Design a binder for this molecule. Structure first.
Ligand SMILES: Nc1ncnc2c1ncn2[C@@H]1O[C@H](COP(=O)(O)OP(=O)(O)OP(=O)(O)O)[C@@H](O)[C@H]1O
Ligand SMILES: Nc1ncnc2c1ncn2[C@@H]1O[C@H](COP(=O)(O)OP(=O)(O)O)[C@@H](O)[C@H]1O
Ligand SMILES: [Mg+2]
Lengths: 91, 519, 520
């Protein structure tokens, strides 16, 4: 939020299933009901993280934290035919 | 500093107050950087985190709770009656109390959501965690502070997040347990062990006597036997097309429409569209796929609204395919008219009721004795049932039509379609006998008749389980005559009147009755 | 400096043994030479706290009056004669020797018979401290032996935790589900009387005296306990309850406790005796009383709802309207066969949750180079071997009894035990299969109310079988008027109560040649 000089950043998290408690922290970060009262180990004043937009990607949906799957919407990305990949490579 | 003030609003038991006092003093005399400082810090973090003695103010008004339960969910008479009894018992006790309920049934019938409605009605806090992938005692009972990266299980997390000594805790999909967490759950679910539940990480015991436990599962068979003795089994039914349409119209369309941000003026879903969705696009016992279809069509309608392609949308069966694509499951049954060799049967699995067909044919033409090849991923129990059925069919044919040499000489191949899906259970014995006899005599069975029930060696029909789901599936498949064992009469008539309206039901004790009915 | 006095004052009332006092005071002298902020000071502080918190020489003042303890024991439980006699003998020995003592008991039996509750009642009766120790699913020895003090975290094990909590050297420790353990070698030191008196923990590094601890282990099956662990414990059996005993328990204990739990009163909701008998007979079948407790709780919950909602000011439960409370009876059928056709013979089995009746059905697979037998019904390997032995003996018997009868040596016979879903095993049905095959071959039904059990050898000798109590109960329930048992089970049959065996015309046999005469 500092280096991007914005109040409503768009954050992508990649490979959400390869995570190891950071999992509970990201779970509560995905909860809009508490994101307005976000506080960390360094700052003693809360920061309102309600306006952020979160996108997550992973190769498989069987991420180790169970309460992830019901909070994130399943959108599947499919493969490419040879002609599609040919045009992509050319461009 | 702030750690002492947090205990002022609570009622801290002495056996933990002394421990937290000693640990806090030890941290106060210890340095501010060592690893043991970090360990003591975390230990007192979860010591002071949980809300000692802070109850939640329950509502004991029967009328308002009944109104809330009726408003939130359709049907579910057993659960609502159980909760009303719970509230009456709490009124008589003059104090809060906590039982251990269990809801089992096919997925997508509303087991989880009724728990949320109960929590809202009882004003208790709600929390849900799954134990389907649980494989060790540690993740439920916690890890000791000695080991690196220890955590206080999940129940302590439940208490700290819910901020309540008497919340509602929903344990989900308990029917799958890894190789032992069952002992840990029994320790957690024992009513006598509730009052002194001792977590590995948080050494001090906690009083879980007041918490309300709800258990979610698909089948009660796989639940460990010691756990079944601790919990009260309550069954959640499947839905017929009428109930599916009622639920859709009342809840699914409005909730999904609000979720998409639309309102009734912009996107109207006609009842015909919902009927087509239920009958064709969603072949299931719950409403898990119907909700997805409704969400999809409302999302596409919203996208149409934004782009200006239309100021308002009226979903009609003609333009429905422009929203949800082409139909799937266009045929109700794989056999509309059964040839002489096949008989329709009923099945019950973890995913609700289902219908199966038993197929027979000649491996080689007639002119040493006969044989029966069995295929279709049948289990050991069903293979033994097939052998018993073959023996009894031979015996019955040698007395009903003694001149018939078909079953004692010909080679029969027994198949059950959907060869990829494994099948098990002795409930198909009468179906196999009927299929074999119909093949031997060359006569088809009644074109809309379905049967279920174990058959013994002498022809006695034994009772089978899952009559309710089998009847629901049979009604869905549009049958008009159903044959059940006589010992399942007490379980069949517990169905609602409109479930068993058009079914001509026959209760049998011996296979001769089924032979008379079918032919 | 004041922490040294805090540690010292804890030893004023205790009687610390020499080898412990040396460790205590050497750590006291060591502590003065360390600065407060050092980590070694922290670990020494923890070690001193653990050493000084152990109740060295603290004994709970037990009551040794047999009359008072017996009055307490009958006040909480019904009919557990063996456990009560054991506790009375324990108290008698303690009184005679003039000092407290420790023992290792093992109450094993089917679930729901009250092992944990009777252990709690024994602890209350003996005025000893009580502590639960759930070993079920435990896999790391650190729970019992702890870790070395060097590690950042350290435990003195669960036993030293018990010693600290109970503040006595002679508590009552409940070690449940010893048959569901993952590991076990740590328990040997805990409960071996040759080394139990000097139990050494890896954290404390000093042996404590556990010879006065009364260990009460509970298990469901005895074979799963390792043999070295099973050798050190006294196995005490807690048996299942007959219908009469379950009725007595429900009338005296279950119903009042469920009423107190539900807040009812006797004048508000009365539960008749015949209603309890009907619930026991038809709505639940188990060795314990767990299901009966659920049924009673359901009835009382329904009564409470009717009272609160204003439906009625009082409710009376009768067998006429019991279905309105607990629905239709789930077990209503008594026997599969009322009149047995020629090919089927009634049998008995020692199934789980009490014995149950099984039938043996035989039928021809083919009309009219020798014959063959096909067995189905999820039989085990031992039961398949028993079927083979029975088939061979039936052939041999019919060769010499009716030489002209060619049935068994050529016919293709299918043998089935009904209820194929339930797995079945054991040689108990050895004679039942022989009787079924012979009745099929002779085309004659057996006595219509006859039941039998017993292993058969190849020469026809009848060997003893287990579970005579359960099989007798099952035969009595189903309406059997004549039962056949092996002669070596005579004492087992006659050891039962008078009200269990009065109606049975029992026959004791040594060879099948006379079972043949009895059955026909
Ligand atoms: N003889 C009896 N008199 C009164 N109540 C009894 C008797 N036997 C059992 N009960 C009751 O039955 C229930 C059995 O609970 P308990 O936990 O003691 O059983 P258990 O067989 O020891 O269990 P588990 O094998 O699961 O450890 C209790 O409510 C107990 O009070
Ligand atoms: N009887 C009912 N009344 C109202 N809604 C229902 C009913 N049954 C199912 N639903 C809807 O179905 C959706 C999915 O149910 P779900 O909680 O997934 O059931 P389960 O927990 O058994 O899988 C819920 O959002 C709920 O609104
Ligand atoms: Mg126990």
């Amino acid at each position: 939020l500092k280096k991007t000089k914005t109040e409503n950043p768009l954050i992508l998290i990649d490979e959400v299933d390869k995570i190891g408690d950071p999992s509970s922290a990201l779970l509560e970060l995905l909860d809009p009901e508490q994101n307005a009262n976000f506080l960390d180990h360094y700052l003693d004043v809360p920061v309102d993280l309600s306006k952020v937009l979160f996108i997550c990607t992973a190769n498989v949906t069987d991420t180790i934290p169970e309460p992830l799957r019901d909070r994130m919407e399943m959108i599947n990305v499919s493969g490419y035919v040879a002609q599609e990949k040919l045009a992509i490579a050319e461009r | 500093e702030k750690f002492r003030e947090r205990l002022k609003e609570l009622v801290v038991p002495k056996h933990v107050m002394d421990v937290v006092d000693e640990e806090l003093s030890k941290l106060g005399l210890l340095d501010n950087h060592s690893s043991e400082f970090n360990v003591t810090r975390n230990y007192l973090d979860w010591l002071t985190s949980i809300p000692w003695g802070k109850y939640s103010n329950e509502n004991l008004d029967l009328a308002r709770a009944q109104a809330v339960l009726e408003e939130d969910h359709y049907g579910m008479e057993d659960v609502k009656k159980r909760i009303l009894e719970f509230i009456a018992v709490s009124q008589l006790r003059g104090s809060t109390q906590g039982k251990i309920l269990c809801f089992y049934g096919p997925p997508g019938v509303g087991k989880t959501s009724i728990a949320r409605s109960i929590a809202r009605a009882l004003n208790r806090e709600y929390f849900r965690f799954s134990v389907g992938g649980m494989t060790d005692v540690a993740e439920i009972k916690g890890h000791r502070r000695t080991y690196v990266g220890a955590m206080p299980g999940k129940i302590i997390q439940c208490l700290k997040k819910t901020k309540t000594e008497n919340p509602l805790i929903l344990i989900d999909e308990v029917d799958k347990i890894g190789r032992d967490p069952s002992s840990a759950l029994l320790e957690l679910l024992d009513p006598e062990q509730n009052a002194n539940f001792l977590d590995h990480y948080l050494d001090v015991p906690v009083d879980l006597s007041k918490v309300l436990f709800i258990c979610t599962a698909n089948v009660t068979d796989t639940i460990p036997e010691p756990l079944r003795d601790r919990m009260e089994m309550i069954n959640v039914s499947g839905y017929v097309a009428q109930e599916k349409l009622a639920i859709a119209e009342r809840y699914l369309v409005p909730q999904a429409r609000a979720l998409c941000g639309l309102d009734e003026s912009k996107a109207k879903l006609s009842s015909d569209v919902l009927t087509l969705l239920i009958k064709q696009y969603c072949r299931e016992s719950g409403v898990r796929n119907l909700q997805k279809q409704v969400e999809k069509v409302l999302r596409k309608s919203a996208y149409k609204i934004v782009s200006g392609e239309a100021e308002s949308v009226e979903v009609t069966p003609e333009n429905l395919q422009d929203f949800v694509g082409k139909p799937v499951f266009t045929v109700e049954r794989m056999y509309d008219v059964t040839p002489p060799g096949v008989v329709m049967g009923l099945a019950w699995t973890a995913m609700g009721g289902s219908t199966l067909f038993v197929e027979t044919s000649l491996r080689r033409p007639q002119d040493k004795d006969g044989s029966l090849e069995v295929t279709g991923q049948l289990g050991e129990v069903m293979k033994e049932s097939a052998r018993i059925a073959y023996t009894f069919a031979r015996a019955f044919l040698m007395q009903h039509a003694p001149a018939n040499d078909y079953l004692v000489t010909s080679h029969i191949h027994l198949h059950v379609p959907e060869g990829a899906t494994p099948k098990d259970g002795p409930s198909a014995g009468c179906t196999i006998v009927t299929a074999l006899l119909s093949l031997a005599m060359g006569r088809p069975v009644r074109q809309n008749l379905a049967m279920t029930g174990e058959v013994s060696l002498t022809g006695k029909i034994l009772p089978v389980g899952g009559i309710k789901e089998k009847t629901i599936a049979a009604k869905r498949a549009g049958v008009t005559c159903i044959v059940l064992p006589a010992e399942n009469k007490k379980d069949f008539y517990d169905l609602a009147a409109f479930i068993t309206e058009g079914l001509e039901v026959h209760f049998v004790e011996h296979y001769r009755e089924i032979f008379d009915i079918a032919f």
